[PDB]
Design an enzyme around this catalytic site. Structure first.
Site, PDB file in Angstrom:
ATOM      1  N   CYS A  32       0.845  -1.189   0.000  1.00 12.85           N
ATOM      2  CA  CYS A  32       0.000   0.000   0.000  1.00 12.85           C
ATOM      3  C   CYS A  32       0.884   1.244   0.000  1.00 12.85           C
ATOM      4  O   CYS A  32       1.491   1.585   1.020  1.00 12.85           O
ATOM      5  CB  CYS A  32      -0.928  -0.035   1.216  1.00 12.85           C
ATOM      6  SG  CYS A  32      -1.620   1.548   1.777  1.00 12.85           S
ATOM      7  N   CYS A  35       0.134   3.924   2.562  1.00 15.42           N
ATOM      8  CA  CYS A  35       0.526   3.507   3.907  1.00 15.42           C
ATOM      9  C   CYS A  35       1.993   3.829   4.171  1.00 15.42           C
ATOM     10  O   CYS A  35       2.350   4.316   5.251  1.00 15.42           O
ATOM     11  CB  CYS A  35       0.286   2.008   4.092  1.00 15.42           C
ATOM     12  SG  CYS A  35      -1.408   1.440   3.817  1.00 15.42           S
TER      13      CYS A  35
END
Ligand SMILES: [Cu+2]
Length: 107
Positions: A32, A35
């Site tokens: 991700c 993230c």
């Protein structure tokens, strides 16, 4: 990155739900991008809010059980806990200034 708590599905109850103070939980995964963008921001928050807020991370690839319990549909998602109950959530990446606003909104 030394003060961030590393959560697991097994330790979540003890480390978050049974805790009294405020805990900001980051649900994340290595694949991700956003993230990884907020990871250094969380390190700064952990340092800046030491003694007032615990920052913790739960990898959803390694811990597939917890995120569905909170209806999490995407990452990154920040969950702010107080006294074992969700006080606020934020879906998607954000700046340090925005994360400070998010926390002050809950103070
Ligand atoms: Cu891990």
């Amino acid at each position: 990155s030394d003060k961030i708590i590393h959560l697991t599905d097994d330790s979540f109850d003890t480390d978050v739900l049974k805790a009294d103070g405020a805990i900001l939980v980051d649900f994340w995964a290595e694949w991700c991008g956003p993230c990884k963008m907020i990871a250094p921001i969380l390190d700064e928050i952990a340092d800046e809010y030491q003694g007032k807020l615990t920052v913790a991370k739960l990898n959803i690839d390694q811990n597939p059980g917890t995120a569905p319990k909170y209806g999490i549909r995407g990452i990154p998602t920040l969950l702010l806990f107080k006294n074992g109950e969700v006080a606020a959530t934020k879906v998607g990446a954000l700046s340090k200034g925005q994360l400070k606003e998010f926390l002050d909104a809950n103070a």
